[PDB]
Amino acid sequence: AMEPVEDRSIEISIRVDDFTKTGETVRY
Amino acid sequence: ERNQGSAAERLITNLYLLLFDQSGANPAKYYIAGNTFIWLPDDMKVKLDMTQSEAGERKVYVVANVDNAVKTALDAVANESDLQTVKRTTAMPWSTDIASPFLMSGNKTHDFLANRLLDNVPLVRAIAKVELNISLSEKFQIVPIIVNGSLSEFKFRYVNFDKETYVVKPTTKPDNLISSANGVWPQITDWTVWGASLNTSPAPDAGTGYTLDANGKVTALRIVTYLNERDSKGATVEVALPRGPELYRLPLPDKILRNHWYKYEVEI
């Protein structure tokens, strides 16, 4: 069984990158 | 921690792809228009009609949620470095003039001869987020004067926030600064009174709020805002509490980094 020519239309996966979340306690 | 945020924070309404060749020039451009929403959100995948042999090795940039100004600038991009000159200006660069959908960018280098699929391009929001949760000590736990839900006696301002949102951060981002108020003590006439938009029960992602005890005394304050990145020091949040009022300054970090969420537990 022959596969398609390996010259295919391209695809780009995209993921939304999570925040980098930081916590800090401050007092006055 | 890594935190995926809300659906609004993740919303993609359009995409612009730039595929640079080896020399970081001659980028193939694809604008995937919001009115066509090819973009496969359910696969988190873009399909292009460029073939593997046409693509070869590419430096692939993806920009999300552009407006027409930013798009047209991207249409004129010739070199990779040009991306670091494309920026959106916001007159009042904090919430809610900065709101969803957020500008995002990311890139990856990929050889499409080797694999038709680039897995994957991490899309990084170009703005940051600041969250203050203020716990009030006894001397501030008063029955507040409330007007239309807002606290007349509790006020805040943003100091030295940057007006520019760059698509790609320059090596050293220059300054274009503004503050939300400039009134001096004791009147602080143009500072912003504390709001209650966060007190609602779906609760938006940004705003101001507060908590009252059973005696109707205010015991906590909350403020959440988006803001632009800074490579330079000086961004500040200031708050005025009833005593002229008592002013408290929270210097934000020496750098405000894109796609960072800075949460403070503040005791005053």
Numbering used by the authors:
A (entry chain A): 24 to 51
B (entry chain C): 52 to 88, 92 to 297, 309 to 333
Original paper wording:
Despite low sequence similarity, they have a similar architecture and are built up from five proteins each; FimA from proteins FimA-E, and Mfa1 from Mfa1-5. Mfa4 is predicted to localize to the bacterial outer membrane before it is integrated into the fimbria.
This lack of knowledge is partly due to the lack of structural information; hence, we present the 1.9 Å resolution crystal structure of the P. gingivalis fimbrial tip protein Mfa4 in its precursor form. The crystals belong to space group P212121 with cell dimensions a = 54.68, b = 84.54 and c = 138.36 Å, containing two molecules in the asymmetric unit. Diffraction quality crystals were obtained after in situ proteolysis using α-chymotrypsin, resulting in a cleavage between Tyr51 and Glu52, closely mimicking the RGP cleavage that is performed in vivo after Arg53. The N-terminal extension (residues Glu26-Tyr51), which is not included in the native fimbria, forms two consecutive β-strands (β1a and β1b) that run through both the N- and C-domains of the protein. Intriguingly, after the break in the protein chain, Tyr51 and the following residue, Glu52, are 20 Å apart. In Mfa4, the β1a strand is mainly anchored via Ile33, Ile35, Ile37, Val39, residues accommodated by hydrophobic pockets. We hypothesize that it functions as an isogenous chaperone, filling sheet 1 before the polymerization reaction is performed.
